[PDB]
Design a protein around this ligand. Structure first.
Ligand SMILES: NS(=O)(=O)c1nnc(NC(=O)CCc2ccccc2)s1
Ligand SMILES: [Zn+2]
Length: 222
């Protein structure tokens, strides 16, 4: 069922659009969030095992998505292994840090053996053109189709060597807004241009940022 960021489709209305989408408005542990009050804690370290892969690059009419047909790109945290399935973007960002919104956000979406979801988020500040993403921005389809394995990419490049993160629990930020999702947001920011963000926006057709949802009973760990 059709959903979007403006008109009658809009996020305030996602719950009304379909019975399958009802948690988008009813649910109490939704993403994204404004990270403000955090409990300081001893979080387990992230180990990143990403590598040059063949990826498929899609415009799905809501975001640009780099898909990974095959495994082998993994993240280990607290002894569990999560497989990178895909990563995509939001312009502007969805999450905030103390009210701060960033020009863009990347979401690296994983599953472990148990099928537990985990999104790892990189926030991009205003700065230099992003060299490492230009591979993707060149091949970026500007209509609802896919550019296929003619496309090597190394997602190692897109993560910092400092892997300090905020940790909370929440939802998909898109319908059907399934809860059950672990969020790690990295404290270290990468960088983009204005020209790169607008190209994304041009291609996807709109700004694809869901408003922040109350944290409610949830605690963010620093
Ligand atoms: N905006 S976002 O970063 O939170 C999203 N990421 N994935 C979305 N939906 C899917 O990936 C389809 C399959 C799926 C469902 C549940 C868990 C993992 C994968 S929304
Ligand atoms: Zn996302």
């Amino acid at each position: 069922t059709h959903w979007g960021y403006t008109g009658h489709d809009s996020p305030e209305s996602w719950g009304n659009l379909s019975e399958e989408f009802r948690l988008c408005s009813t649910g109490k542990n939704q993403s994204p969030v404004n990270i403000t009050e955090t409990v300081s804690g001893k979080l387990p370290a992230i180990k990143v095992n990403y590598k040059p892969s063949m990826v498929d690059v899609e415009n799905n009419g809501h975001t640009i998505q780099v898909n990974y047909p095959e495994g082998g790109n993994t993240l280990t945290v607290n002894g569990r292994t999560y497989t990178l399935k895909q990563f995509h973007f939001h312009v502007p960002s969805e999450n905030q840090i103390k009210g701060r919104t960033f020009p863009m956000e990347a979401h690296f979406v994983h599953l472990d053996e148990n099928k537990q979801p985990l999104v790892l988020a990189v926030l991009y500040e205003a700065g230099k053109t992003n060299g490492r993403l230009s591979s993707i921005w060149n091949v970026m389809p500007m209509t609802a189709g896919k550019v296929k394995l003619n496309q090597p990419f190394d997602a190692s490049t897109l993560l910092p060597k400092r892997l300090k993160y905020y940790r909370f629990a929440g939802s998909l930020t898109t319908p059907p807004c399934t809860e059950g999702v672990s969020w790690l947001v990295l404290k270290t920011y990468d960088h983009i241009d204005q020209a790169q963000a607008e190209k994304f926006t041009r291609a996807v057709g709109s700004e694809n940022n869901r408003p922040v949802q109350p944290l409610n009973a949830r605690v963010v760990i620093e």
